[PDB]
């Protein structure tokens, strides 16, 4: 009960997206390799770079920064079934609103418990009879250990009635990763970053945060230079904001200009 | 006493009573809103553009444009920018929602022969909000300016006021329940998203019937245009305010106070070369 | 109530249907094939109906929608249903020996969408008031061909008739719908009835299905058509048989009172007069 | 040096043509009032931000605005000029093209140029070519050499050669202050001047005129018919609606079955 459910290989993106319908979070095994894992890894370096205790480090504009990010990450198939499964028929369309890598080292405080939907006051008054709105894809771009203070999470806790009550500590599990391992968790399930007791060692993590496409991004993407958004697939274009949704409720479009294809509209292949 | 209408709301009328009815009443009217200069030029720098894009198997009972702020300076200064719109948006929106932006401008031109509309609710495009009926939290604002006169004869909008509050949004009423909103210069009528409404039959054989719409969106709901081709020139000769209704500028919500549209944790519209 | 009962009846029987209880259903009656292509050669038409140049939509979907002037618009209309057998032999029995001919008043694509409100009952022939009046012993004017281009279903809001309705001795009363059967139909089937016969479009509780149908309403040689097709290009009108033109007005009709004709150009036939082939 | 030699106020309409036959171009201070210069601007303001880069060009004057339709159509100074300009021989005249003119900030100077130049039978006869364009050029915006004023080079009409345009330190900048017009000759070089001013636009309104026997560059005939019908007959002339009485073929010319144009094809007489 008090436990995070693991999915292999051998497990089919159905079982994910029921296993994180269930329980709120879901660990991925063997999603990156150790090679894919290190090329993220020394894309983002020189960037995270360009920045006393350690203080925790954070980047996003990940498409501007890393190859790696634009084209495998954005067009991960899995990613895309469990977005596909988890807003389902109703919904439609999505889009990725932040992507960011998050460094906490050595001596870093333990976090408070939380729900990232919090940040919408009309759909966290809704508690579990909300709508899907945020899908977290969290990849350990490092192992995550207890003692550097792996996140912990509440397993059931997105169908609690009262999203005010946040639980207590010792209903969290801690989701133990090996490196390129992922975990998926909704924006309504309560979790918090440990406390890193390693005064050696860096936990970092790459997350993909998704919304439907009738919410906001927290990501602006404007600015993102020409050329490496005509580098990248209309798919991985439309996670970033560059091509019009098609919502299953107005499929003619949204997000248009002059009522017509966005991405066409300024520059962009047909 | 006997009978029920729309609420006006005349020139001594406060927003903050014009509010008071909107949400009491789900629409409201505002006499004597635009002068008939502003109306004047609005529907002179909307011509030229109507006529590019239907000077050429159909007829045209029907017009519709929008991308206004490319168009309209009159629109991208003078209503993009209007103080009474203002004060109703952050009334309507009110503490816990903080920003807002537009998501829809468009001219909508109804000529002799159009059919009545069905009864509707514009929010029904967000079924994860519209299941929740008159609970929801506010979403959509419409305000509606009459560029010609809005008579019954020419179709003039049709409203049940205190639907936006009906616990049930698969009812959208009967037409028994309308009340005709008739408008004649650049006056305007508000409404919510959850306000049952419908245009009506245009049964004259001469007369146009013209309206500009502004749909106003919180800062988290995805507006439905998209202003990135907007020329660069013509988004710096409009005022900051304006910027961020297109969404050049950072949202502020109340909730994540550090901000939200944002390009590198930092504001957009300077991210992507505006004035700070 | 209604006879859905004309698989193997010939148009005879379907005449004596049509009398006796003012409305019948036919089955099969166009092919899978001749409704694909009907829709097919219709979506444009009425995908650009009130704004050609603008989709329509700005998050308002049209859940009503109607079009006619369909022979300038859709070929297979145009040859396959303006001269199909047996639309001619029922119009041939339901006007009989004094009206001799006939021509189509109205041809139109009617759609009704989810959340559209249920129709008042009513009987078509009350747009002539000189006629209405007549009750049940009133001529025969209106005879109206309705082709399901969608299935015909309770929930979509299949159109609901009560049959015997055409004789009733006052047309002041129009009935209630505990007296009206639903007309369930497939793709290929039609429900034909008069202008004296009490019927209402449904409601369509659906939430995505969408009600299509072709209406053919039929008038006597001496009723004024609802439409005008005389802005249907000359191409096309040269293309159609000499029945589906006078079916469109482009040809004089010969009642059985005024055997010279009707509808001339100078006294001569009217088509022959405005270029068309004797 | 030069100079443009500057008119109006008091000079007649001779002496124009008189300052246009020996310099080739002429500065006719305070042609339009300034309430004139506000419609015109007020009138061509919506037509210019739809017309979908500071440069602008526009045409199709009669059916966009009213003032042109009526006031400078029919403008009494603009006639006489043309009378006098294209003299005896010629009898008639029409208008070729309207067009308002915009060049804002970063505009590169022009080469220097003769417009007729688009006639190579009648470019090559240089100075002693038949008169053939007359250029107005109204200024609907103040005219500056830091906003690219247009210089000219007056006697190079007379040329006889038009192989040489001249040189950049002839040239003579127009300066003009607002219904301010400069007149000049489709033989006369001239060249836009470069806009430094990061602020301003130039806004310019240019009325070439023909002599009867060269085609117009603008067709007019899906002009409205009510504009048309609103327009005076001398103004319905100027845009092709009338037939032309040169003097010529005193007859006319430019009719239908031997007819007047224009009531043959349903205007008044
Ligand atoms: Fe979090
Ligand atoms: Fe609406
Ligand atoms: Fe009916
Ligand atoms: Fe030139």
């Not at 991004?217 to 996670?239: C, D, H, I, K």
């Amino acid at each position: 009960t008090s436990a995070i459910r693991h999915a292999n290989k051998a497990t089919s993106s159905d079982e994910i997206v029921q296993i994180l319908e269930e329980d709120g979070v879901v660990i991925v095994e063997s999603f990156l390799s150790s090679d894919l894992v290190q090329k993220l890894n020394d894309e983002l370096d020189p960037h995270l770079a360009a920045l006393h205790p350690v203080t925790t480090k954070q980047m996003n504009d990940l498409p501007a920064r890393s190859q790696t990010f634009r084209q495998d990450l954005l067009n991960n198939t899995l990613i895309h079934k469990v977005c596909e499964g988890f807003y389902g028929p109703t919904v439609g369309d999505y889009w990725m609103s932040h992507g960011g890598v998050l460094e906490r080292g050595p001596g870093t405080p333990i976090q408070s418990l939380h729900r990232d939907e919090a940040v919408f006051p009309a759909i966290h008054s809704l508690s579990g009879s909300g709508p899907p709105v945020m899908l977290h894809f969290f990849i350990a771009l490092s192992d995550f250990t207890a003692e550097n203070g792996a996140t912990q999470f509440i397993p059931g806790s997105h169908k609690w009635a009262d999203f005010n009550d946040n639980g207590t500590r010792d209903q969290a599990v801690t989701a133990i990763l090996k490196a390129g391992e992922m975990v998926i968790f909704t924006g309504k399930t309560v979790h918090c970053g440990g406390a890193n007791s390693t005064k050696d060692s860096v936990r970092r993590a790459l997350g993909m945060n998704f919304h439907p496409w009738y919410v906001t991004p927290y990501e602006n993407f404007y600015n993102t230079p020409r050329e490496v958004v005509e580098s990248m697939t209309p798919l991985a274009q439309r996670m970033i904001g560059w091509r019009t949704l098609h919502p299953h409720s107005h499929s003619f479009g949204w997000w248009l200009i002059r009522n017509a294809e966005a991405g066409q509209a300024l520059g962009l292949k047909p």
